[PDB]
Design a protein around this nucleic acid. Structure first.
Ligand SMILES: [Zn+2]
Lengths: 211, 55, 159, 119, 97
RNA sequence: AUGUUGUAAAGCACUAAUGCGCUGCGUUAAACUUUGAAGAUGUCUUUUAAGUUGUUGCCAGUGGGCAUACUGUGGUAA
RNA sequence: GAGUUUGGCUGGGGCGGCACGACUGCUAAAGACUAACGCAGACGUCCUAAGGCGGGCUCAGCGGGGAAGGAAACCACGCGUGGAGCACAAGGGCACAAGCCUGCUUGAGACUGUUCCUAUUGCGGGACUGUUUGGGGGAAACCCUGGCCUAGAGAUCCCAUGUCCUAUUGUGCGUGGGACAUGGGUGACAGAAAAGUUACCACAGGGAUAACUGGCUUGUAGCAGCCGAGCGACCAUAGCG
RNA sequence: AGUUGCGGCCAUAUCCACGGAAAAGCACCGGAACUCGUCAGAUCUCCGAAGUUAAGCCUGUGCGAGCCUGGGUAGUACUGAGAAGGGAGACCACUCGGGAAUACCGGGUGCUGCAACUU
């Protein structure tokens, strides 16, 4: 029947993961977490837009699958297929239970059985993130606004000052990219420190000038 | 029928009335099961115990 | 929850990360005497002669020495009173206690100058310690060490 | 004694007192002890308890004010002062903390403008 | 369980070690002149039926195994108990490494 | 003065999980721990502060509890 | 035809299960103690070696080689912190070892005392000493009183066997009695000798406990909102969602 | 000043690459009648002294991997003791106290005991 959402909104103290004492758990409903072009280079998509949490609560696996379709379809219609990269950042590890009173036994023997899955979420945690070009800014702020109508509670949308999916501020990444200390291969990056052999250090400079 | 099972409520208040007292250590003539090597030098072994637990 | 002898000791009786292996040799060369204070501290690699988990981390006083073992006396609380207990422990689960180091080097120097005072006749026993008192006085100067001018400093946020 | 005062800080008010207010306590509300028995502070009862020592009330006040190593015997000789309520009231919730606007805790050197209305 | 048929061990008569033979010990007959059986038999005469309870509600399959150690000189015996052991064998055919 | 501890938080060094990019970025734990508090808990010294009990006789009632501040467990919840 | 019996726990009782004796990890909030028909499992055995001791060795796995030879046969070099094994549940422990191979053995001897779990307390299971006209292994230091450690457990009364004593008017005995130690068993495991039915029914009580109303709750039941993918010949909102 | 024999604490001592080394030592090294042990004198056991510093042992080097100790992260997270504070709740705030942890940066790389021997 799928009970209403208010029955499993708030966090228990401990998480109840699927592992070897549990064994009877249904499969997760979201299976894709990375959409868009997804192989673009780190220099291509400089802008980052997040959706931040203002609650402590569970996020259903159904609500995460419904918000992903809603946000992908808008960016494909207004931005273009090869113009963004979208990422889900949660993974529902927690398992929910039900006590299943079908004249039965009542509160006698009431430890319940596996029911569904959810992700646990805390104050100021990101939920969805998008990296794109500086011109498709208003398309990304409008796609995420439509998708948080799928979630319970309050959430905020912010435009960040970090560089893409690097976890690094925009002006620190820039002055390390001019000194030739960033190795940029297809999809990922890497920094070069002054720490090892001097010979090994100078091959890295040659990679970072070509690759 | 079906009632409560267990509680430790009020049990610290009972244990603390009149203080929680310590006995005194014995005088080395009261210990049993001593080794024969200590039964030889019994006079100057009692000096070490009796002067440490009553110092 | 059941009540075997080694009940509920998964973390208490364990080695501590790159400190595995059996007892080292200096642990057999220590010399124990009647009246010493000792710490009980289980080594989980030695199976024989070990005490019950209640006594791990307690300090006791020696009253007898056997060819491989010691007898220790100490106090245990049982809901409203204390009781004396007699433990038998092998030499591998025991170490000397440093719990009287402060009090012994202070009582030593006291009798030291007492002999050095009777040599001169002028003596005096009372040398009690005192707790730390209120505060003495200060004469702070600003010829160097110029002040730094601190304050409330408006609030900033970065995301 | 500073640690012991951290334990009872939500029930008392403590702080520092000067010398003109300390003389006004002992002369107005002071008594002695013969061991559980309360005796009046005369010059003759004071000599019998400190034989070759203090003989007036003003000497008791000047050992308390300094350290003077007779502090412990002079403070045990006194009986606790029993005061009145303050004329005017407290002006606060009074079970709130002093730095938060109440009357309980450390008044450090402003304790005199509560104690002078209770004597 | 497989136990050998001979053993060297201490004899309380010889007061040293010697060779013994091993087997299983068992219960003999009860005799009717011991005072307990005398008492139980006069109580069951006449009218009244069963006096003295008898046990139902049993729970046990095994008995302790008790050995008989018989010295080949002086012919002195002593008994010795072991654990539960459903099956017992005294001959041998040792299991080979 | 000198010993004991493995929780909260955090983390990936072991056990069990989890998306991508072809070295990095992303997500987890009552029955995971490389780390690790606040708090608790042993012993010595009144030759530290502040304060001012030991031994034993004859005997009663009681062994359905409940509320709350903070803190857990089961339950959609009460 | 007579007399009598036909346990208990329990989100009412009954049916079912055993949370009724007992071991490991978690619930448990960094000393110890701590509840639920809370979670995940295991117990009523097995072993003359799978017990004791001396010596010699190294395991899971990976890399490069070798007639028939292949995904898997056996020889053999270079590495391998245990990523393997150790009767069984789980936790702890272990590398010239507690693992593998091998030699000899019956300490799985006879007695005796102190102490822990553990108390106001029995039984049980462990630890540590002493005494022997006593063993085994080893050149020797040294170790050994069952199983690498934490489970595998049974009173009073009666009977069977062994050692030391004994029956009061005296002496014996093919007739008995005792002290101590082991075995025969009570699993509802501090331990009665025990089948049902009553709608023909009785008595002492119980709101400590059900079958109707009220009260707290809202999973289910009923009635509503928000979003905007689609539909509506065109056209997200005429109506739908 | 070192090496060797027997050690205590058990990585600041370990692991990987190159180099150095006067005198002694420690080795590698030549053999199998006896002792002892193997499929095999490879290992183990006995008897030796022609040769060599090639290795082992000991010492240097490296913006080396690890380990040890500091800084930053940060008065942040969490938290002991209080009060008729706010909020539908989830939870947030205030007063007096205590106070962590990766990623990043800097510096270090065995210390000692008893004995014998070496220009
Ligand atoms: Zn014999």
């Amino acid at each position: 029947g799928r009970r209403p959402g208010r029955c499993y909104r708030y966090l228990s103290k401990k998480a109840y993961p699927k592992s070897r004492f549990n064994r009877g758990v249904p499969d997760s409903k979201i299976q894709i977490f990375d959409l868009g072009r997804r192989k673009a280079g780190v220099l291509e998509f400089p802008l980052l837009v997040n959706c931040i949490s203002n609650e402590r609560e569970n996020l259903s696996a159904e609500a995460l699958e419904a918000a992903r379709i809603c946000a992908n379809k808008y960016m494909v219609k207004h931005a273009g297929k090869d113009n963004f990269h979208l990422r889900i950042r949660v993974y529902p590890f927690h398992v929910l239970r039900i006590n299943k009173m079908l004249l039965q036994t009542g509160m006698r023997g009431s430890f319940g059985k596996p029911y569904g899955r959810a992700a646990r979420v805390v104050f100021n945690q990101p939920i969805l993130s998008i990296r794109t070009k500086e011109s498709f800014r208003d398309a990304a702020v409008e796609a995420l606004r439509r998708a948080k109508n799928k979630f319970p509670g309050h959430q905020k949308i912010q435009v960040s000052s970090k560089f893409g999916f690097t976890n690094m501020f925009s002006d620190e990444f820039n002055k390390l990219n001019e000194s030739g200390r960033i190795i940029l291969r297809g999809g990922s990056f890497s920094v070069i420190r002054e720490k090892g052999s001097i010979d090994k250090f100078k091959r890295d400079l040659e990679y970072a000038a070509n690759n | 029928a079906k009632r409560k099972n267990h509680t430790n409520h009020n049990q610290n208040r009972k244990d603390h009335r009149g203080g929680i007292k310590k006995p005194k250590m014995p005088k080395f003539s009261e210990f049993l099961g001593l080794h024969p090597a200590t039964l030889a030098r019994l006079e100057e072994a009692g000096k070490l115990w009796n002067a440490a637990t009553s110092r | 929850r059941s009540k075997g002898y080694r009940r509920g000791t998964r973390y208490l009786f364990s080695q501590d990360h790159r400190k595995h292996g059996v007892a080292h040799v200096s642990k057999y060369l220590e010399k124990y005497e009647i009246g010493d204070m000792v710490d009980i501290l289980v080594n989980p690699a030695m199976m024989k002669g070990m005490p019950h988990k209640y006594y791990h981390g307690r300090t006791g006083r020696v009253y007898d020495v056997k060819p491989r073992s010691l007898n220790v006396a100490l106090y245990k609380r049982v809901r409203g009173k204390y009781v004396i207990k007699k433990i038998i422990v092998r030499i591998e689960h025991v170490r000397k206690s440093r719990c009287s180091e402060e009090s012994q080097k202070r009582i030593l120097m006291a009798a030291e100058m007492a002999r050095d005072a009777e040599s001169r006749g002028v003596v005096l026993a009372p040398s009690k310690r005192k707790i730390e008192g209120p505060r003495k006085a200060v004469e702070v100067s600003l010829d160097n060490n110029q002040p730094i001018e601190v304050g409330y400093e408006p609030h900033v946020v970065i995301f | 004694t500073r640690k012991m005062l951290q334990i009872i800080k939500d029930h008392v008010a403590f702080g520092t007192i000067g010398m003109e207010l300390l003389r006004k306590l002992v002369y107005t509300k002071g008594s002695g002890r013969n061991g559980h028995v309360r005796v009046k502070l005369t010059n003759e009862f004071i000599e019998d308890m400190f034989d070759g020592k203090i003989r007036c009330i003003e000497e008791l006040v000047h050992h308390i004010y300094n350290g003077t190593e007779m502090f412990k015997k002079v403070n045990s000789f006194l009986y606790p002062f029993h005061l009145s309520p303050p004329r005017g009231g407290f002006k606060g919730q009074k079970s709130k903390s002093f730095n938060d606007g109440g009357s309980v805790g450390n008044h450090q050197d402003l304790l005199s403008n509560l104690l002078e209305r209770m004597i | 369980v497989n136990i050998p048929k001979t053993r060297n061990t201490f004899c309380k008569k010889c007061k040293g070690y010697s060779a013994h033979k091993v087997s299983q010990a068992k219960k003999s007959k009860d005799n009717p002149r011991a005072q307990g059986n005398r008492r139980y038999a006069r109580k069951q005469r006449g009218y009244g039926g069963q006096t003295k309870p008898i046990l139902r509600r049993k729970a046990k399959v095994t008995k302790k195994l008790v050995l008989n150690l018989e010295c080949t000189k002086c012919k002195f015996s002593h008994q010795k108990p072991l654990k539960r052991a459903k099956h017992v064998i005294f001959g041998g055919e040792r299991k080979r490494k």
